[PDB]
Symmetry: D2
Subunit: 104 residues, 4 copies
């Protein structure tokens, strides 16, 4: 019987959490921590990045092998259909509800 | 300072809150509590509702003098420009920050 | 078969829209247009406002009906339980889906 | 001058976009496309996942060399401070604005 604040503190400590009131079933959210990558890795190996973004990184860093780009922490959802949504966002109801529970 | 979870608990108790970086622009958020308005008002007196929604309420309730629509609680922003944005939403960074302050 | 962009242009024209892919059934979203209220009305008549906000309004504005607070347009949801959520949020999946439909 | 709908169609076609007022801070958003990855890579090689989520995956897929988990497309922000936010949020104002522009 947790508020979103308590759910967030559980997420920050690595738990999976959910709301009892969600329409879908089997769903949960989790936090992915901050990460920092060398820019040359961005430009040439990391995918799921659009060519325009890789070009922007290249044009701002070049061949550097010590320049870094930092990715903030963020929330994700294991959705009803089993897919993963990077970038879960909280509805008004989610933020203000007190029906949060720990899944793991 | 405060976590977003502590900010939400302050919001629920009726405070105005903000992240520290908002200070220069004078931005803050607040909670509007649940409210149930008679349907009559909704169909005939509320001006900030589209005609499609007012219809929908009548397709379902007709001339009911007794049926009410419930509006759940939600967050709002008093923006930099002085306008009010109903339906403030939290970014990943906002959700995970710990620089929230009570404004009032 | 509408994108979110098409759905938003319908929302701007006063229609109710929904996603086929949503888990909850019977739901839809709608736009509430910009509204300008006299500050007297905000301070003394609207119940769904916290006292701290009514004081902020009284302290930073006048009392004559020419004194107005502008509420920007925003999106809302008629939820599965019949409640209304002012301040609907678009998920990553909502924003990028092509399964939007006109509801009215 | 683009609606948010037009910005989204541009995003889906690999462009970097922004609202006109973002230009001073040099912020933009981009889309990362869908990707489908084998569960063993998720459990053992993907770097920013919490232990609890890796454990959930292992306890639903074993070592099956073929099982895959799909990550939906999503939006990201190159923020004012140069960090990358996976899972960018559109505000009410953002969704209804018509001051979107192509950055690249």
């Amino acid at each position: 019987s947790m508020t979103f604040g308590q759910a967030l503190e559980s997420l920050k400590r690595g738990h999976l959490v959910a709301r009892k009131g969600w329409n879908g079933k089997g769903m949960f959210i989790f936090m992915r921590p901050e990460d920092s990558l060398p820019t040359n890795m961005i430009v040439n190996q990391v995918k799921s990045l659009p060519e325009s973004f890789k070009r922007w990184v290249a044009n701002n860093h070049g061949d550097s092998e010590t320049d870094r780009i930092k990715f903030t922490a963020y929330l994700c959802m294991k959705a009803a259909d089993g897919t993963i949504v990077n970038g879960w966002l909280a509805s008004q109801t989610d933020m203000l509800a007190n029906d949060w529970v720990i899944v793991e």
